[PDB]
C-alpha cells in the first residue's frame, strides 16, 4: 500500500453553503488528479498539498493547519493541506509565472531581438520563487513526517524547485515531477538569466522521474541539460540524465481527457449559427492559442469561395487578463474579427468570452470544423474532448506544435500554426470534404483519442515512477 | 592541381578610372576569399562566380558573359564571372533574404506569438529563390563544363539551394557549402512554411561538406534534419547525415580575421573622448548587434558609480536601412542613447553612423572596453580584430551566443545578451580592473585570437572537403 503525497499549484475545492441547513460546506471538485489517485489499486492513503489562492482558502488553511480530510465516493478520502504563503511573496511568484517572464520562457513568447531584457525584477522574482519553493517543500515534508516510504508526486511548473528540496531530506523517496507545459529548445531556454536557467535545472534533476506530455519536450529538456550542465551526461535513447550521482528518467506521459467532463449554447449563438456551417476555435485568453492567425486564415479561405454560408465562433476563456500579453492577444483577435466582418459581411465571425465550461462543450458539439492551431501547447486537451463529443463529424485542424499532435496528428489536419496559407487551405479542404469521408475520419479520430483518459495518465505516472525508482535504487 | 570553382553572393570588385590615363579599370578587392584560395598550394586555377549587384557589375557581365580574367599579385589570376539575374527576381530574392523573412529565420527574430504570419508573399519569394538558385547552378556548371574534376566551393546563405543542383549534374564532384550565419534550433527552423523548411534542407544535403562557423550551428542543423526528414539518419558524434544515398559531413570551421585589414578617428570623436575612458560598441545596423541592450546596461552600470569620466560610443555601419527591422533597430538605439544622456548627462553616449572601415579600426584602437553582445551572431569577426589592434589593454564583453564565443569565450567576459544586470555588472567589473590584470588578459586574448586567420580558414575548407570527398567516394 503506497502512501501518496501529491503536490500541485492548486487543489480545486468548491466553497459554499448547504441549501437546507446553511452550514458552510467545502468539498473536492470531482475529476481532480487527487481524486483519481486515491482510487488506484496500490494506494492506501493520499495527501494533497497545494496553495491557498482564495480568501476562503486562507480561512480553511489557517483554521485547519495540518489539513482537512475530505470524503470521496466509495468511502475514500484525501488529506488536503493548503499552504498560506506570504501574500507579497505569493503575488510576485504568480507574476513570475505569467507571460511577464516564465510563461514566455516555456511557451515561446520572446523574439530575442527586442524582448526580453532582464533587470533587477527578474532577480527579485527568482529570490521570491525560492522562498515559495521552500514553502511547498516544508509543507510536503511535514505532511509526510510520519510516513515510512512516502511517494511524492509533484505537478505543475510552479513546483519545479521542489524535487531538489525533497531529495535533500528524503534521499530514498520516489519523486515524480510532471510539467504540463512545453520545454523550449536549448537555445531558447538559455535566454533566461544564468541563475534561473541553471537553478531551475538543479531543482528538477533530483527527481526520480520527470514527466512531460510529449516526446518533443523531453528532448528539449535533455538538450537544455547537456548544454547548461557540463558535468551532466545525457542519454537521448534511454531518456536519462546522469548528474552528481542523481539518475533521472525522462518520460512522455500523454493525457487526453477526463470522461467525467464529457448543454445549451451561449445566448444568441444557436440562432446566429442557424443555417450556417460553424467553424469553432476555442481556447484561453493566452497568446499561444493563436485565434488571431486562425481568423486571418479563415478570411484567406473565404476569399477562395465556398464559405458563403459559413460562420466562425472564436470561443474564448478569460484568464489572467491582467497580463499585458493576454490583453494584447484579446485586442489583436478583436481587430482581426472586426476586419473579418468588414470584408466578408456583418456577423460572419463572433467572439464569445466566458468561463461556462458547458457552453464550450456545447460549442464543441455544434461545430462543423474545429481549429486548435496553437503556436505551442503543452498538450491541449480540448483537441481530445471536442471530437469525442462532436456528433457532426467535424474535421479537426490541429497545430503540429501541440503536444497532442504526437498522438492525434495522424488523425487530424496537421498544420504549421504560423503559415496562414497552409491553414486557409486546410479550412477550405476540411469544409469541401463530403459527409462520408468526414464520418470515417471522425470515427478513426475518436478511436485514437478515446484511450487517453485521466485514469490511464495517472496509472502511467505511478507505474512509471515505480519502475524508475526500482532502477534508481539499483544504480 | 585542383580546378576551383568558387560561388558566392558577391565578388567585391572596385570600378573606377586610372588617374593618369582615364581608362576604366576593374580589379579585385584584396583580401577576398577567391584571392586567398588562388594562393594555396594545390590550386592550379580558380573561377569565381557571383551575382551582378551594381550597374558596373551588369556592364562588366554583358561585355564578358563567360567571365573576365583578373590579375593578382605574383602573377596569379581568377576568372570572375558575374551573373545578370532577372531584376524582378533578384530584387525579390534580396527581400527574401532580409529580416523580412529569411534573416529572421536563421538569426532568431520572431516571437512566434505575433510574428511571423506567412502569406502568399512567402510562396512567391520561394519560387523566385528557385529561379535565382538555377541561375547560379547553370552559371557554375557552364563555367565548369570543360573541367575534368571540378571542385565546388559554395558560400553564403543565398546559395543554400545550389549544392543539390550541382550534384544533379556532377554526381562525383566535391561540393562544399559554407553558411556564414547561425542555424536555428529545430523548433525554430520549422516555423518556416513546409515547402521552405524541407526544401532548403533538400538543397543543402547533397553537398559533400556543409560548413558552419560554430559547433552550435552544426548541432542545430543536424537536429533540424532529424526532425524534418524521417528518411534521414544523423550521427551527432560523427557529425554526419545519411539521406537518400547522400553522405554529408558537417564541419565547424571558425574564422577570426584577415591580417590584410589590420588611422584617423571619426570627426570630433577624439576630442569628445579626450579625458574619458571610452566604451565602444560596433556593428551593422542590424537588430542582432544588440546596441540597445548595451546602452541600457551601460546606464545600469553608471548608476552603480565609478563611471563618471566614462563615455560610450555606439559605432554603427549602415546596411539595409530599407528593412523595417533595421530602421526600427536604429530608432530603438537612438531612443536608448537619448535617455542615457537625459539621465547621466549630455554627451555621455554618442552614435556614429557611417560606412568607413578605417574609422571603425580607429575606434577599436581607442577603446578602453569593447562590447560585442550580439543576440546571436554567426561568428562576429569584429571581436577578433578589435583586441588584436587595441593597444590599450581593453577588456572585451562577448555574448555567449556569438559563434566566436566558442573560440574566445574563455578569454573574454562572456554574458547572456538578454540580461542587462549581468551585462551591467560586466561593464563595471571590466572598468574596475587594474592595469596589470587587463594587460595579462589582453595578451592571452590576442594569443587566442591570432591563429584564426582567413588563410587558415580557407585551408580548413579545402583540407576538410578533401577528406570528406575521399570518405564519400568510399561509401
Ligand atoms: N473553466 C472553463 N474551462 C473551459 C472553458 N472552455 C473550455 N474549458 C476547458 O479547459 C480545458 C482546456 O485545456 P487545454 O485545451 O489543455 O488548454 P490549457 O488552457 O493550456 O489547459 C479543456 O478541458 C476545456 O474543456 C471555459 O469557458 N471555462
Ligand atoms: N564597410 C565597413 N565595414 C566595417 C565598418 N565597421 C566595421 N566593419 C567591418 O565589418 C566586419 C564586421 O563583421 P562581423 O563582426 O562578422 O559582423 P557581420 O557584419 O554580421 O559580418 C569587420 O571586419 C569590421 O572590420 C564600416 O563602417 N564599414
Amino acid at each position: 500500500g503506497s502512501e501518496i503525497f501529491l503536490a500541485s499549484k492548486r487543489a480545486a475545492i468548491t466553497y459554499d453553503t448547504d441549501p437546507a441547513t446553511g452550514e458552510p460546506r467545502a468539498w473536492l471538485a470531482p475529476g481532480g488528479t487527487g481524486n483519481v489517485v486515491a482510487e488506484q489499486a496500490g494506494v492506501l492513503n493520499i495527501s494533497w498539498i497545494a496553495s491557498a489562492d482564495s480568501e476562503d482558502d486562507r480561512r480553511a488553511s489557517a483554521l485547519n493547519p495540518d489539513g482537512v480530510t475530505m470524503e470521496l465516493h466509495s468511502g475514500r478520502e484525501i488529506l488536503v493541506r493548503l499552504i498560506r504563503h506570504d501574500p507579497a511573496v505569493f503575488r510576485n511568484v504568480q507574476n513570475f509565472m505569467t507571460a511577464n517572464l516564465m510563461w514566455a520562457a516555456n511557451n515561446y513568447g520572446w523574439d530575442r531581438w527586442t524582448q526580453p531584457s532582464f533587470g533587477s525584477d527578474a532577480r527579485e522574482g527568482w529570490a521570491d520563487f525560492g522562498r515559495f519553493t521552500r514553502d511547498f517543500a516544508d509543507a510536503i515534508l511535514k505532511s509526510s513526517a510520519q510516513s515510512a516510504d512516502p511517494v511524492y508526486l509533484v505537478h505543475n511548473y510552479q513546483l519545479v524547485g521542489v524535487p531538489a528540496l525533497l531529495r535533500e531530506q528524503r534521499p530514498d523517496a520516489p519523486i515524480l515531477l510532471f510539467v504540463h507545459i512545453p520545454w523550449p529548445s536549448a537555445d531558447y531556454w538559455r535566454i533566461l538569466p544564468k541563475e534561473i536557467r541553471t537553478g531551475i535545472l538543479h531543482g528538477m534533476l533530483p527527481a526520480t522521474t520527470i514527466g512531460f506530455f510529449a516526446d518533443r519536450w523531453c528532448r528539449n529538456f535533455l538538450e537544455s541539460v547537456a548544454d547548461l550542465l557540463p558535468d551532466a551526461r545525457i542519454d537521448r535513447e534511454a531518456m536519462t540524465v546522469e548528474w552528481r550521482g542523481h539518475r533521472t528518467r525522462l518520460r512522455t506521459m500523454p493525457l487526453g481527457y477526463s470522461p467525467l467532463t464529457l448543454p445549451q449554447l451561449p445566448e444568441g449563438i444557436e440562432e446566429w449559427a442557424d443555417g450556417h456551417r460553424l467553424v469553432v476555435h476555442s481556447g484561453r485568453t493566452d497568446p499561444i492559442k493563436n485565434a488571431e492567425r486562425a481568423v486571418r486564415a479563415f478570411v484567406l479561405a473565404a476569399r477562395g469561395g465556398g464559405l458563403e454560408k459559413t460562420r466562425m465562433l472564436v470561443r474564448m476563456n478569460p484568464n489572467r487578463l491582467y497580463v499585458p500579453a493576454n490583453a494584447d492577444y484579446v485586442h489583436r483577435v478583436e481587430t482581426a474579427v472586426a476586419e473579418a466582418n468588414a470584408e466578408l459581411g456583418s456577423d460572419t465571425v463572433r467572439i464569445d468570452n466566458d468561463n461556462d465550461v458547458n457552453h464550450t462543450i456545447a460549442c464543441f458539439r455544434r461545430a462543423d470544423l474545429l481549429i486548435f492551431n496553437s503556436t505551442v501547447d503543452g498538450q491541449n486537451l480540448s483537441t481530445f474532448e471536442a471530437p469525442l463529443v462532436n456528433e457532426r463529424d467535424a474535421d479537426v485542424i490541429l497545430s503540429e506544435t501541440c503536444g497532442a499532435a504526437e498522438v492525434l496528428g495522424e488523425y487530424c489536419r496537421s498544420v504549421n500554426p504560423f503559415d496562414l496559407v497552409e491553414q486557409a487551405e486546410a479550412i477550405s479542404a476540411a469544409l469541401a470534404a463530403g459527409p462520408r469521408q468526414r464520418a470515417e475520419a471522425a470515427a478513426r479520430r475518436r478511436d485514437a483519442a478515446r484511450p487517453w483518459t485521466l485514469e490511464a495518465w495517472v496509472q502511467a505516472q505511478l507505474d512509471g515512477l515505480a519502475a524508475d525508482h526500482a532502477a534508481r535504487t539499483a544504480t
Side-chain angles (χ1 to χ4, degrees), chain A residues 1-22 24-34 36-54 56-141 143-148 150-259 262-435 437-475:
Chain A
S2 290
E3 304 194 290
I4 297 290
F5 293 98
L6 171 62
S8 73
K9 86 210 222 211
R10 184 158 103 91
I13 286 146
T14 326
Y15 300 93
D16 45 36
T17 40
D18 184 274
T21 165
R25 298 177 308 161
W27 76 117
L28 258 190
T33 306
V36 159
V37 176
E39 234 173 30
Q40 304 309 304
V43 178
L44 172 72
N45 57 52
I46 171 179
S47 297
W48 196 350
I49 302 100
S51 288
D53 199 359
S54 73
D56 276 314
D57 276 347
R58 180 203 64 70
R59 318 202 227 290
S61 150
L63 214 173
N64 309 281
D66 282 7
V68 57
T69 287
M70 326 216 90
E71 265 177 34
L72 299 170
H73 67 260
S74 65
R76 294 310 190 179
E77 70 191 18
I78 315 117
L79 243 180
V80 182
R81 169 177 187 158
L82 291 209
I83 313 179
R84 284 177 299 150
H85 312 268
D86 182 273
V89 162
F90 199 34
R91 179 201 29 201
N92 204 25
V93 172
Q94 262 174 172
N95 178 63
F96 193 70
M97 320 286 300
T98 66
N100 292 342
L101 217 169
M102 279 316 288
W103 187 258
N106 288 75
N107 287 272
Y108 284 140
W110 293 318
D111 62 358
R112 274 174 272 212
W113 284 0
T114 74
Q115 296 233 263
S117 296
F118 300 106
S120 63
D121 277 346
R123 305 262 148 120
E124 286 152 32
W126 174 247
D128 277 335
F129 188 53
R131 287 189 273 287
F132 171 84
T133 299
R134 318 192 254 273
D135 267 326
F136 259 94
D138 315 342
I140 294 156
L141 290 159
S143 282
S144 48
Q146 315 316 329
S147 178
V151 176
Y152 298 105
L153 303 177
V154 191
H155 280 227
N156 312 120
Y157 198 76
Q158 287 84 334
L159 304 200
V160 289
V162 170
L165 300 192
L166 295 191
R167 178 74 66 214
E168 253 176 40
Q169 316 273 324
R170 287 279 186 167
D172 306 316
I175 304 159
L176 176 101
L177 172 67
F178 201 94
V179 176
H180 292 235
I181 61 176
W183 198 272
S185 305
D187 287 13
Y188 193 86
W189 176 248
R190 79 144 69 204
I191 286 162
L192 287 168
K194 283 162 169 170
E195 75 180 1
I196 301 169
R197 66 188 189 196
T198 65
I200 282 176
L201 300 177
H202 294 179
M204 323 170 57
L205 284 174
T208 303
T209 302
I210 296 169
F212 289 94
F213 281 132
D215 289 340
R216 186 168 297 266
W217 316 145
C218 289
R219 286 201 304 279
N220 306 345
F221 179 86
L222 287 185
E223 310 284 355
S224 289
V225 174
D227 182 38
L228 290 185
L229 313 184
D231 37 41
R233 290 336 171 102
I234 71 165
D235 189 312
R236 320 192 163 64
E237 307 274 20
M239 279 294 219
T240 57
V241 177
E242 293 323 290
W243 180 64
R244 313 180 158 179
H246 306 282
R247 201 258 217 192
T248 312
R249 171 70 188 275
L250 272 283
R251 283 182 177 270
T252 300
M253 308 199 187
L255 171 64
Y257 69 107
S258 165
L262 68 72
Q264 47 284 3
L265 261 293
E267 209 208 327
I269 285 304
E270 185 179 335
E271 319 157 316
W272 168 73
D274 217 28
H276 298 76
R277 290 182 301 175
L278 182 65
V279 175
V280 168
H281 178 305
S282 180
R284 272 195 291 101
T285 47
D286 194 316
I288 75 180
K289 297 301 162 172
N290 213 22
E292 201 268 3
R293 283 195 191 90
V295 169
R296 299 301 180 172
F298 176 88
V299 169
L300 296 184
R303 299 179 187 172
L307 303 207
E308 49 272 352
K309 289 165 61 183
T310 309
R311 283 165 175 187
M312 191 163 159
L313 177 62
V314 176
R315 171 108 172 119
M316 255 181 159
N317 182 1
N319 164 210
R320 280 161 215 164
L321 277 314
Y322 50 80
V323 182
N326 294 348
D328 172 63
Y329 170 68
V330 185
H331 177 73
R332 292 182 293 109
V333 177
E334 287 165 356
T335 302
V337 175
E339 309 193 331
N341 289 325
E343 160 180 11
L344 312 173
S346 325
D347 259 24
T348 301
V349 187
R350 268 188 186 195
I351 305 180
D352 201 60
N353 224 303
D354 167 37
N355 277 337
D356 192 2
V357 67
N358 307 284
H359 286 165
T360 296
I361 306 314
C363 297
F364 285 165
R365 299 191 175 271
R366 173 63 185 83
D368 300 294
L369 168 61
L370 301 145
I371 299 169
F372 299 111
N373 69 324
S374 305
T375 63
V376 68
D377 230 315
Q379 181 76 342
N380 185 318
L381 310 196
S382 292
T383 197
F384 290 81
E385 285 164 6
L388 284 173
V389 303
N390 184 270
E391 263 179 62
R392 297 192 56 75
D393 311 307
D395 210 326
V396 170
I397 294 167
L398 180 68
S399 166
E400 67 183 21
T401 63
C402 281
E406 298 202 339
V407 165
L408 295 174
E410 172 158 89
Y411 305 91
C412 299
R413 300 195 179 266
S414 181
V415 299
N416 173 338
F418 312 110
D419 183 348
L420 305 182
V421 177
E422 188 193 359
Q423 286 174 89
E425 299 181 341
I427 290 164
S428 294
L431 295 178
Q437 192 248 302
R438 279 194 289 100
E440 318 207 341
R444 290 225 308 150
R445 178 177 312 115
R446 290 192 301 267
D447 286 350
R450 207 175 333 267
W452 301 99
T453 64
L454 219 76
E455 172 154 54
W457 177 65
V458 168
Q459 281 168 7
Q461 288 165 222
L462 298 173
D463 304 345
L465 178 58
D468 318 332
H469 177 237
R472 181 186 178 270
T473 298
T475 190

